[PDB]
């Protein structure tokens, strides 16, 4: 589920930016620094909705940089294990299905693809289809998957999806 939360971040403003428009520069730098970044604790941050407060800028001894602790309201998304989430399949391969859920990308391993499914490599767009052809899962389709687990690496989060349970798969 998407979450709107207040986040704590410290802006080390370079002295050249002091004087007029300092706080505006802090706001601009905050967006620039936090937006487009991800953290294992809070996940991906989409946008800063507003800033709760700009703390008193502590001048760093020797560094000259001023450390501004900032509280800002932002929207984030984190995948939770043991939960069902709607997803869009991005790439289909014999190894598994790659899917996108907002900022997060989830992978469904072949072992987690239902027994009724089977990969159809001869098809021009790779897809998995059932023996009776009742449902077909391909790229850019509406599917629901179970978050088996969440992993984080290099400021990126990727989860494992499963379609074995009921009400899953193509919807």
């Amino acid at each position: 589920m998407f979450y709107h939360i207040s986040l704590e971040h410290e802006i080390l403003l370079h002295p050249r930016y002091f004087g007029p428009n300092l706080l505006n520069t802090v706001k601009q730098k905050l967006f620039t620094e936090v937006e487009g970044t991800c953290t294992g604790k809070y996940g991906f941050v989409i946008a800063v909705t507003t800033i709760d407060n700009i703390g008193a800028g502590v001048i760093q001894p020797g560094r000259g940089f001023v450390l501004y602790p900032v509280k800002y309201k932002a929207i984030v998304f984190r995948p939770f294990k043991g939960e069902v989430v709607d997803a869009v399949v991005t790439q289909v391969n014999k190894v598994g299905l790659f899917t996108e859920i907002g900022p997060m990308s989830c992978f469904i391993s072949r072992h987690s693809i239902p027994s009724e499914m089977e990969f159809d490599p001869n098809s021009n767009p790779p897809c998995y289809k059932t023996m009776d052809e009742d449902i077909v899962i391909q790229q850019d389709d509406e599917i629901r998957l179970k978050i088996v687990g969440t992993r984080v690496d290099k400021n990126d989060i990727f989860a494992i999806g499963s379609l074995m349970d009921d009400y899953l798969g193509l919807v």
């Binding site: 072992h111 987690s112 693809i113 027994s115 499963s162 074995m164 349970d165």
Partner: protein
């Protein structure tokens, strides 16, 4: 008490009588220790029969006869 043991792992029968058999569409007896083994790897197929299964596909059913186990589930479904 009466079951001599599961073909996969029978220690549970001698260990304690509180554990219950897990039924599958495979019509093949399996038990709780096997459940953990299939969750980590090869969740898609039976350990020996090779028949495909959707992850664990394990349900509690205490009959000793797997045919009755399967037929009772068939009974309800039918």
């Amino acid at each position: 008490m009466d079951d001599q043991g599961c073909p996969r792992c029978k220690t549970t029968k001698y260990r304690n009588p509180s554990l219950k058999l897990m039924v599958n569409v495979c019509g093949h007896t399996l038990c709780e220790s096997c459940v953990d083994l299939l969750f980590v790897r090869g969740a898609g197929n039976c350990p020996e029969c090779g028949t495909p299964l959707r992850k664990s596909n394990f349900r509690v059913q205490l009959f000793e006869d797997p045919t009755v186990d399967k037929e009772v589930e068939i009974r309800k479904k039918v």
